[PDB]
Design a protein around this ligand. Structure first.
Ligand SMILES: O=C(O)c1c[nH]c2ccccc12
Ligand SMILES: O=C(O)c1c[nH]c2ccccc12
Lengths: 141, 141
């Protein structure tokens, strides 16, 4: 028994790094940076979301997200717009061009996830996803 | 249903970022950088491990780890040594000074982990830790 062997933050960080690194290699081989992939995948099939929400789901600092959106909007892959009510809030959406650019990569991402989860079986896979979702929802600001 | 809502790499990354960020604030309030905390906590109670293993468990790139160890060894918190056999391998250990420096923070880390896991109950907490450990062991290089 070493402290790190069963310390939750260390376990989450290692599992996340290893799984994400595998798929990020595929994304780069398909011409996407990790940050572009995270943004487009987070916006695909979504209503417009705030910059702060996008930063949270992409685990990226908000100033970095803003600069990324500057370049992604220049390339027509995303669009920023004002919020219906509070204009201290900028919303962002994926465009059709961005969705078409990322659709095949998303199918590859689903295949990779299926391979990662297959050894665990449907019950354990769903339990993992449910626990992770509940943890996120309890700890998000 | 949006793709990102139940995409495993996104769930792992968000849960990890949120949980780790909470404890990293405590570490900094106790005078530790995140990288110093990760290294000392990973070495506490451990036999000497390779630099590559340390980089994996601390989710830090190996060149960055080497520079970090240069400064941590200068401060007497860790020690590098040669491997018994293959001297292409450098091992690293925590020193008594480093252990005494980090012991209280480790107790705080255990308390924080207990609070994070308490709402899930012992069964779900252990299932999460077991799944994460099995995933790491399947995906580590
Ligand atoms: O806090 C984190 O994110 C950690 C990731 N790897 C680790 C190893 C030891 C302690 C904390 C962490
Ligand atoms: O691949 C990752 O690490 C991701 C973290 N947040 C995301 C959101 C959408 C897609 C991938 C990720």
């Amino acid at each position: 028994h070493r402290f790190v062997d069963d310390y939750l933050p260390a376990l989450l960080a290692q599992a996340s790094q290893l799984i994400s690194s595998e798929f990020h290699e595929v994304a780069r081989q398909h011409g996407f940076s990790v940050s572009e992939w995270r943004v487009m995948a987070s916006l695909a099939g979504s209503e417009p979301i705030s910059i702060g929400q996008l930063a949270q789901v992409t685990v990226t600092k908000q100033p970095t997200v803003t600069r990324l959106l500057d370049r992604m909007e220049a390339r027509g892959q995303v669009e920023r717009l004002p919020h219906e009510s509070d204009r201290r809030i900028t919303l962002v959406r994926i465009t059709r061009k961005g969705l078409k650019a990322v659709e095949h990569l998303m199918e590859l991402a689903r295949e990779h996830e299926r391979r990662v989860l297959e050894p665990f079986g449907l019950r354990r896979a769903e339990e993992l996803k449910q626990t992770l979702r509940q943890m996120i929802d309890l700890h998000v600001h």
